[PDB]
mmCIF file with all atom_site columns, C-alpha atoms in Angstrom:
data_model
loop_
_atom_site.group_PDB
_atom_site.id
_atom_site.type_symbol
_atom_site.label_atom_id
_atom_site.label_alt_id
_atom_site.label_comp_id
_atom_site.label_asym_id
_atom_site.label_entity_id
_atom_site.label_seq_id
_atom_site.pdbx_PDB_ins_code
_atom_site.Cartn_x
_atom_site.Cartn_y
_atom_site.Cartn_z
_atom_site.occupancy
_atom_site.B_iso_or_equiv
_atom_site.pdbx_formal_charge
_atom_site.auth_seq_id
_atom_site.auth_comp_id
_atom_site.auth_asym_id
_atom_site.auth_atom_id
_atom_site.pdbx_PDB_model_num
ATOM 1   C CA . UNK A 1 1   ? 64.769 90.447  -85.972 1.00 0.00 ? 150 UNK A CA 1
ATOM 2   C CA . UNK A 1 2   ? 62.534 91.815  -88.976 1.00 0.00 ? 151 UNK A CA 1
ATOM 3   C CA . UNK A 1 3   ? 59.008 92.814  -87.783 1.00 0.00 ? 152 UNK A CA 1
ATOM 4   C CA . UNK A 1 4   ? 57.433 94.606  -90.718 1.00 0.00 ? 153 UNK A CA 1
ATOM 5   C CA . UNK A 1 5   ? 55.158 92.387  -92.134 1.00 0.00 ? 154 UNK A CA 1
ATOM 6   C CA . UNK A 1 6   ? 53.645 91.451  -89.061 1.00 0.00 ? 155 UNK A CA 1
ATOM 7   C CA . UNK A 1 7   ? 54.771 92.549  -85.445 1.00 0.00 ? 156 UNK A CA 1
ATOM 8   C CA . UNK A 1 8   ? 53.359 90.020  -83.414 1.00 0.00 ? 157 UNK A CA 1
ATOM 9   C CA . UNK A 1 9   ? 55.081 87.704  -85.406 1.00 0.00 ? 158 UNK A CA 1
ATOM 10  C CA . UNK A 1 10  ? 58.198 89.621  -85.016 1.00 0.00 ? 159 UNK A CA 1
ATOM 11  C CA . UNK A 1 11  ? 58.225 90.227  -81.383 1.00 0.00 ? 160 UNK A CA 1
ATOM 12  C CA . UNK A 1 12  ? 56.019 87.241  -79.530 1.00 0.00 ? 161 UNK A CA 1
ATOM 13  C CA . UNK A 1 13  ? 57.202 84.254  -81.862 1.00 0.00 ? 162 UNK A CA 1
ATOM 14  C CA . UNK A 1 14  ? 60.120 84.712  -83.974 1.00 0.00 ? 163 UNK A CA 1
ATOM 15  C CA . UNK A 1 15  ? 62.156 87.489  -81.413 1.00 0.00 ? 164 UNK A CA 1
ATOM 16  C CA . UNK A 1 16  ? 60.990 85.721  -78.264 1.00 0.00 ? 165 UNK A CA 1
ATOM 17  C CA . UNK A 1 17  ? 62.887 82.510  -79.787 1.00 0.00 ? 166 UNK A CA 1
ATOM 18  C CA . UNK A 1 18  ? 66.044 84.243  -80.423 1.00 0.00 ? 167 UNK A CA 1
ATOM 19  C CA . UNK A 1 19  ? 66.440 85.351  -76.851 1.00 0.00 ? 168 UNK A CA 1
ATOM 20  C CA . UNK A 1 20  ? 64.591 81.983  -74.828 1.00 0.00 ? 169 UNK A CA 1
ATOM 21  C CA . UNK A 1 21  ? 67.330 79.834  -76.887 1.00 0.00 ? 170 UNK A CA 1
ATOM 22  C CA . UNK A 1 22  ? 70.164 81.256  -75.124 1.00 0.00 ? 171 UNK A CA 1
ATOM 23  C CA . UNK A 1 23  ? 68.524 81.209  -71.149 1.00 0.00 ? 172 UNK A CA 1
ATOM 24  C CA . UNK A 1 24  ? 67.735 84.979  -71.667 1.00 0.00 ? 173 UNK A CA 1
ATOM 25  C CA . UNK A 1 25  ? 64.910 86.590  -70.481 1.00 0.00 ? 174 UNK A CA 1
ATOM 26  C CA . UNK A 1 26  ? 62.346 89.243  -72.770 1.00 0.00 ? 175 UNK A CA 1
ATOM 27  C CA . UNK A 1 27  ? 61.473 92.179  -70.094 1.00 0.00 ? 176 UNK A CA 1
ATOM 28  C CA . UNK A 1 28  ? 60.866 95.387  -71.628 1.00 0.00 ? 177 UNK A CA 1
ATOM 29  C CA . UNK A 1 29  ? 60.775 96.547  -75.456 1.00 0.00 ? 178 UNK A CA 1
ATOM 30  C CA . UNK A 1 30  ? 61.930 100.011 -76.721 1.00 0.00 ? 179 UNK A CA 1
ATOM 31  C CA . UNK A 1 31  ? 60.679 101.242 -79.977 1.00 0.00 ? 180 UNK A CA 1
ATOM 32  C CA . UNK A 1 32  ? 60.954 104.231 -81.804 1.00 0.00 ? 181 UNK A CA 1
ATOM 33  C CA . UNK A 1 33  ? 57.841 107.008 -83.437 1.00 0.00 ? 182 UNK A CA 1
ATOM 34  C CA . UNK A 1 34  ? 58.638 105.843 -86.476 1.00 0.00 ? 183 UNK A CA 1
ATOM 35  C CA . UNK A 1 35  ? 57.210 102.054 -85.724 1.00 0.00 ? 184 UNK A CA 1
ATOM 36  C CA . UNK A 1 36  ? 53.806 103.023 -85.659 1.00 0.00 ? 185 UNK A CA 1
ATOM 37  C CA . UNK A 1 37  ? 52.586 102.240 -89.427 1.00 0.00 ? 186 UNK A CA 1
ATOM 38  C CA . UNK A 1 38  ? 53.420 98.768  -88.999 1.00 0.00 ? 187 UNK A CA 1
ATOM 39  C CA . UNK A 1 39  ? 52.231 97.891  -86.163 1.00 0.00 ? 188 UNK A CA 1
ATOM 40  C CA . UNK A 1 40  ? 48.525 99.805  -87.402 1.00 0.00 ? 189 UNK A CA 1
ATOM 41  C CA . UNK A 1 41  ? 48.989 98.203  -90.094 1.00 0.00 ? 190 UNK A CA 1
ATOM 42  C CA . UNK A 1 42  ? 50.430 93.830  -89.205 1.00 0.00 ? 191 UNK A CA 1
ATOM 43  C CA . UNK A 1 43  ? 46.775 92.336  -89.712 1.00 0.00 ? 192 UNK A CA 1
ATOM 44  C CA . UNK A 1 44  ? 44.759 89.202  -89.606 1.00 0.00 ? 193 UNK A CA 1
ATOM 45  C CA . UNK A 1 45  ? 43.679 87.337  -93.002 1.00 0.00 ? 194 UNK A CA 1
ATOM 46  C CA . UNK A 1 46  ? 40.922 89.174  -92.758 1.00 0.00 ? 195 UNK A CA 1
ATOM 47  C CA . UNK A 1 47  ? 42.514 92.745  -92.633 1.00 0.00 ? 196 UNK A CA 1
ATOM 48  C CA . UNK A 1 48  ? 41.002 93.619  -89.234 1.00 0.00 ? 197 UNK A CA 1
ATOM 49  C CA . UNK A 1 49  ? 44.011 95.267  -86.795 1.00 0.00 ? 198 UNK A CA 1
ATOM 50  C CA . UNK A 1 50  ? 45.751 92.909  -84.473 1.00 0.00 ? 199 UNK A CA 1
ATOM 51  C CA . UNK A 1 51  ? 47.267 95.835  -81.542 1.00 0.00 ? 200 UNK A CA 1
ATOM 52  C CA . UNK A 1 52  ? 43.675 97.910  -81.449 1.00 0.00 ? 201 UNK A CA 1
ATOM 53  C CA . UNK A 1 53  ? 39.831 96.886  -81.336 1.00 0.00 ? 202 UNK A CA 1
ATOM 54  C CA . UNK A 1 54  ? 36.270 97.796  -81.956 1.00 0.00 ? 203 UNK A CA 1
ATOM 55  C CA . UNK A 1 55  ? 36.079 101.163 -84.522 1.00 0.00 ? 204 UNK A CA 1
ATOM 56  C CA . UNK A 1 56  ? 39.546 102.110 -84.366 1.00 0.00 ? 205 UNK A CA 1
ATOM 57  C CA . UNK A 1 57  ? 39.041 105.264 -81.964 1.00 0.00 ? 206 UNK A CA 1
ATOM 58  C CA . UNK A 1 58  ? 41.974 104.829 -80.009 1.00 0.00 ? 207 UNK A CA 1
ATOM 59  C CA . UNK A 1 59  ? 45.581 104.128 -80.329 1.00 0.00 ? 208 UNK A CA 1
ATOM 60  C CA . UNK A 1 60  ? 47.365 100.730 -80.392 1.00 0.00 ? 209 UNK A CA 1
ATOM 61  C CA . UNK A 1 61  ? 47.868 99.850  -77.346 1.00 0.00 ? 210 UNK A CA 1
ATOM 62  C CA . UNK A 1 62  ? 51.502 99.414  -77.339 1.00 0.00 ? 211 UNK A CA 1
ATOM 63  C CA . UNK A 1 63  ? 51.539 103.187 -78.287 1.00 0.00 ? 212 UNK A CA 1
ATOM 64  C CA . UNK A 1 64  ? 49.349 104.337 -74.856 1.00 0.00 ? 213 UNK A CA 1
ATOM 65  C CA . UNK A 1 65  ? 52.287 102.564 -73.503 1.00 0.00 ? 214 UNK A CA 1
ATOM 66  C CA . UNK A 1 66  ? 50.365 99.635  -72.553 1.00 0.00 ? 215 UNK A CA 1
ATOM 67  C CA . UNK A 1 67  ? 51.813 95.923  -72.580 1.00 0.00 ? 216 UNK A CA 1
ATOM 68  C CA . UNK A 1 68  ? 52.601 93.639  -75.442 1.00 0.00 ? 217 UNK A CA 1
ATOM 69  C CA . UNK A 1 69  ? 52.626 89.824  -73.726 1.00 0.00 ? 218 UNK A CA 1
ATOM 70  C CA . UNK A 1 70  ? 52.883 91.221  -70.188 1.00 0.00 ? 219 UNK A CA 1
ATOM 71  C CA . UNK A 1 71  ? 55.896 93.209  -71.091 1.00 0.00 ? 220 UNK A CA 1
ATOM 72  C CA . UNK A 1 72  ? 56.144 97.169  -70.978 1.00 0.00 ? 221 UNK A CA 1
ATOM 73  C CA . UNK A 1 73  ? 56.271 98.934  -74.187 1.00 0.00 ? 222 UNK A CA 1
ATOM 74  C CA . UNK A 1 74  ? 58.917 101.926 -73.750 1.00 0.00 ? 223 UNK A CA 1
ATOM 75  C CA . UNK A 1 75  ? 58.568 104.725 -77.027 1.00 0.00 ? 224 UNK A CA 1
ATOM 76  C CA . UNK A 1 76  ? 61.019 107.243 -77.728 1.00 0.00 ? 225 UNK A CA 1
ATOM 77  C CA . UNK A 1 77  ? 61.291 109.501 -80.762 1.00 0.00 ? 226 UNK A CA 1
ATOM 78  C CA . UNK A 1 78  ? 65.270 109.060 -81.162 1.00 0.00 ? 227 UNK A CA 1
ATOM 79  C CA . UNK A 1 79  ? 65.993 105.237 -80.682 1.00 0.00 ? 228 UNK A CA 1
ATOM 80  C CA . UNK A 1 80  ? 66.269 104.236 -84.639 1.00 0.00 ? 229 UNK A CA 1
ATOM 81  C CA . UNK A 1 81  ? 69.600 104.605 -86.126 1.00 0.00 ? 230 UNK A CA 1
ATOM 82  C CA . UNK A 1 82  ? 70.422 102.829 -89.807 1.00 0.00 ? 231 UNK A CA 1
ATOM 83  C CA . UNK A 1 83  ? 68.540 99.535  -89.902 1.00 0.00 ? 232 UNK A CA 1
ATOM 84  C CA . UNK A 1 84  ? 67.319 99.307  -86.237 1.00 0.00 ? 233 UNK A CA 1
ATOM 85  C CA . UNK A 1 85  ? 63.713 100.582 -85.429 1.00 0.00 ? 234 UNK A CA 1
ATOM 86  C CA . UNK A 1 86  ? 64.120 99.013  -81.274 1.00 0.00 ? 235 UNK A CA 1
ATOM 87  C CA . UNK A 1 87  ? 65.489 96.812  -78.948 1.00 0.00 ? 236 UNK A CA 1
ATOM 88  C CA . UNK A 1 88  ? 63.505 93.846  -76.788 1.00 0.00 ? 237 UNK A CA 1
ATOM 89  C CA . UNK A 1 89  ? 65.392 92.036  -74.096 1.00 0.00 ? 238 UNK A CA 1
ATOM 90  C CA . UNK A 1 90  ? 66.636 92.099  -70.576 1.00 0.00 ? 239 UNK A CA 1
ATOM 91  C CA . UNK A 1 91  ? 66.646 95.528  -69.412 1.00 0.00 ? 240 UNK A CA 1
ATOM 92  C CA . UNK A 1 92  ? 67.741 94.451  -65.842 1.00 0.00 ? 241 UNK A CA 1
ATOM 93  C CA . UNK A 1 93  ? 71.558 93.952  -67.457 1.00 0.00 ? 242 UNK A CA 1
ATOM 94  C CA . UNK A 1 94  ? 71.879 97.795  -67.672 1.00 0.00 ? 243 UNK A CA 1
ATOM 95  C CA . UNK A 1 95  ? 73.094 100.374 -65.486 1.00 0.00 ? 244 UNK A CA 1
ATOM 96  C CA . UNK A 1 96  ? 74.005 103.501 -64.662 1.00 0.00 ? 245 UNK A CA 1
ATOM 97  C CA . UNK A 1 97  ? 74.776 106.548 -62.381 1.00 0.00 ? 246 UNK A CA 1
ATOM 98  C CA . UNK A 1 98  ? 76.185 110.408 -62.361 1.00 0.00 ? 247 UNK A CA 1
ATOM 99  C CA . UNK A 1 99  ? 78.958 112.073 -60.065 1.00 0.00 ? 248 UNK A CA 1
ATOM 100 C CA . UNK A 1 100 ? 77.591 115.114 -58.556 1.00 0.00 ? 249 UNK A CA 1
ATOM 101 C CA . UNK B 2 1   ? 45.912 81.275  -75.732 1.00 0.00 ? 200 UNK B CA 1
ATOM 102 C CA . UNK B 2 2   ? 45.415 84.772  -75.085 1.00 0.00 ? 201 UNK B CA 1
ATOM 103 C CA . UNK B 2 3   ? 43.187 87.819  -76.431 1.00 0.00 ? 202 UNK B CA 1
ATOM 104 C CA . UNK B 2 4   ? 42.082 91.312  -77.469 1.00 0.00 ? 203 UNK B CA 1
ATOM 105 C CA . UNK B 2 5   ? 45.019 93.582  -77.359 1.00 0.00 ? 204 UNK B CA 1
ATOM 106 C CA . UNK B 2 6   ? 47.086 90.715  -76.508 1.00 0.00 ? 205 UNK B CA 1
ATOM 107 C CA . UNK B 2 7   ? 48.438 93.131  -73.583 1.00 0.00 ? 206 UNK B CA 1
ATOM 108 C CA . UNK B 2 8   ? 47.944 89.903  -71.091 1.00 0.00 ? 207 UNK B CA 1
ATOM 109 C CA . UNK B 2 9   ? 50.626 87.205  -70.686 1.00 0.00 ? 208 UNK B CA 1
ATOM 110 C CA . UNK B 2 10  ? 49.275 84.058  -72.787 1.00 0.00 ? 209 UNK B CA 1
ATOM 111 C CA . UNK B 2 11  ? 46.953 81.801  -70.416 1.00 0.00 ? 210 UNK B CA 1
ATOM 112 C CA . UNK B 2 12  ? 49.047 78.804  -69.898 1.00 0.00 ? 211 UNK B CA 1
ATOM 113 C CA . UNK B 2 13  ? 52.069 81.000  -68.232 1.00 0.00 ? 212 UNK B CA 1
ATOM 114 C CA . UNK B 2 14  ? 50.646 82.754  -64.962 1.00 0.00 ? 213 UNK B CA 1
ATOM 115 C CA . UNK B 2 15  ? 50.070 78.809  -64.119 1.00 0.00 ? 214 UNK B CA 1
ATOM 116 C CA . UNK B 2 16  ? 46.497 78.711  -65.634 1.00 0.00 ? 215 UNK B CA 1
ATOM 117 C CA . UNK B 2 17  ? 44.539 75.486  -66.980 1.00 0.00 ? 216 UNK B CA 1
ATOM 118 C CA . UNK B 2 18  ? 44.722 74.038  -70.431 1.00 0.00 ? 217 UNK B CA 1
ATOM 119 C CA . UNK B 2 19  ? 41.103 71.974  -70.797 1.00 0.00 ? 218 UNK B CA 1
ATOM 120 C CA . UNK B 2 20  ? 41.148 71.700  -67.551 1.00 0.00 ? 219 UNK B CA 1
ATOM 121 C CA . UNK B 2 21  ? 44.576 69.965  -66.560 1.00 0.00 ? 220 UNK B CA 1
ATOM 122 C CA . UNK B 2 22  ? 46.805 72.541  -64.701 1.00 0.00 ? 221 UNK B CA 1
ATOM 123 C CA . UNK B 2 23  ? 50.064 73.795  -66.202 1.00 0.00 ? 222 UNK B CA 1
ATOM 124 C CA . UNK B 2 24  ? 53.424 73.843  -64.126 1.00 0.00 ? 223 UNK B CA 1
ATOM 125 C CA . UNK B 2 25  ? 56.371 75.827  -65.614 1.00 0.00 ? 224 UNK B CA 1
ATOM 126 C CA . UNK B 2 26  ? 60.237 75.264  -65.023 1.00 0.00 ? 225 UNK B CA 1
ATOM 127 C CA . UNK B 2 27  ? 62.844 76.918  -66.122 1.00 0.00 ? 226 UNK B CA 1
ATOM 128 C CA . UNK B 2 28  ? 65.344 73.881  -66.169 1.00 0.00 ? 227 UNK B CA 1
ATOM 129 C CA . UNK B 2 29  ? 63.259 70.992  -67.224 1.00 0.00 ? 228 UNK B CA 1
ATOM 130 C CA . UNK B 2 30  ? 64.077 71.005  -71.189 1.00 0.00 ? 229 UNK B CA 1
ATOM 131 C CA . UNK B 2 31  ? 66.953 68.827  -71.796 1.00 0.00 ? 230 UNK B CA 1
ATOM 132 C CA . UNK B 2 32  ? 68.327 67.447  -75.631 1.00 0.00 ? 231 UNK B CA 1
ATOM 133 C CA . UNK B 2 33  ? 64.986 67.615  -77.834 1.00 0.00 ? 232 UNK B CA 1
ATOM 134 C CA . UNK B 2 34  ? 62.500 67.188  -74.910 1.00 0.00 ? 233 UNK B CA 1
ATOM 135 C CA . UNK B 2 35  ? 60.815 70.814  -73.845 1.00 0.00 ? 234 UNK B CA 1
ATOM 136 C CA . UNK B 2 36  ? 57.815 69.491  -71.118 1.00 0.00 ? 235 UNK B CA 1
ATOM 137 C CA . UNK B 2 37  ? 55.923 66.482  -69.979 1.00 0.00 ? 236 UNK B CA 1
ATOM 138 C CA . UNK B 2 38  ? 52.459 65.774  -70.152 1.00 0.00 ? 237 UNK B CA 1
ATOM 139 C CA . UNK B 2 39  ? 50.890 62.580  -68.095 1.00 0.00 ? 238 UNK B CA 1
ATOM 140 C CA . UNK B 2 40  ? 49.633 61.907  -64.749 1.00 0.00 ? 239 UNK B CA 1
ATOM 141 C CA . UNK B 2 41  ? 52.104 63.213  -62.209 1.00 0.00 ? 240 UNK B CA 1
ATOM 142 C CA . UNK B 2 42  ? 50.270 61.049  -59.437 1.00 0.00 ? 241 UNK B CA 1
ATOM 143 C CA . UNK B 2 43  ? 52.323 58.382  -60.210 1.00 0.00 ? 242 UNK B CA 1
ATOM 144 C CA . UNK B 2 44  ? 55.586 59.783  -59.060 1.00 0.00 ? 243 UNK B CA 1
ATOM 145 C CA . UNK B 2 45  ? 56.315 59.915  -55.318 1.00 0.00 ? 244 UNK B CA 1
ATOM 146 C CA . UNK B 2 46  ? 58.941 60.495  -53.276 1.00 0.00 ? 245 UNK B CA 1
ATOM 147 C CA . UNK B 2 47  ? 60.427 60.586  -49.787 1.00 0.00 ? 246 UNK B CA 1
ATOM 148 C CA . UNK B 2 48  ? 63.183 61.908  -47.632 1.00 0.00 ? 247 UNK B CA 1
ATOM 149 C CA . UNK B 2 49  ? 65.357 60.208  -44.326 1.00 0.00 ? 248 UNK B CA 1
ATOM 150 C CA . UNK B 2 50  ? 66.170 63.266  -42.042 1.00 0.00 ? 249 UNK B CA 1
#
């Protein structure tokens, strides 16, 4: 999914519909330092922010780690690789452990 | 539906109102082309023997 123009767009509408299509649930999204600009800068017509209110004194709130739609917003600084800036989806399909 | 930071889970979902009618979700009601149904669910009923 492309989010640049706009990134509620991109995640909430057009994403969302990719994943709900196939029975799949959207529980966490992942997103890398270097998605910041656009989501400062996906507007309304007007050119007021979409992500952050009042006069723009604190971060968007996906970046304090807050929710987007009810789901968490994870950031890392070393997640893009190539074309790919994130991942939303299930994150309850993954896991993991270590020996010793 | 929803507002501010859009943080929130849009106002329909968490079983709120819409103009006043309540919402119900499923996650097996779509079927073909048909996603929901709107109406008066008072005229449905329904029993069981045993």
């Amino acid at each position: 999914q492309s989010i640049s123009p706009n990134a509620y767009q991109g995640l909430g509408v057009s994403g969302l519909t990719k994943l709900v299509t196939d029975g799949k649930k959207w529980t966490h999204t992942l997103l890398d330092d270097t998605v910041e600009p656009v989501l400062n800068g996906s507007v309304d017509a007007n050119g007021r922010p979409l992500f952050v209110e009042s006069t723009y004194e604190s971060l968007t709130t996906p970046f304090r780690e807050g929710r987007i739609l009810g789901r968490p917003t994870i950031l890392s600084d070393h997640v893009a690789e190539g074309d790919v800036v994130g991942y939303a989806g299930d994150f309850s399909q993954i896991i993991w452990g270590q020996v010793g």
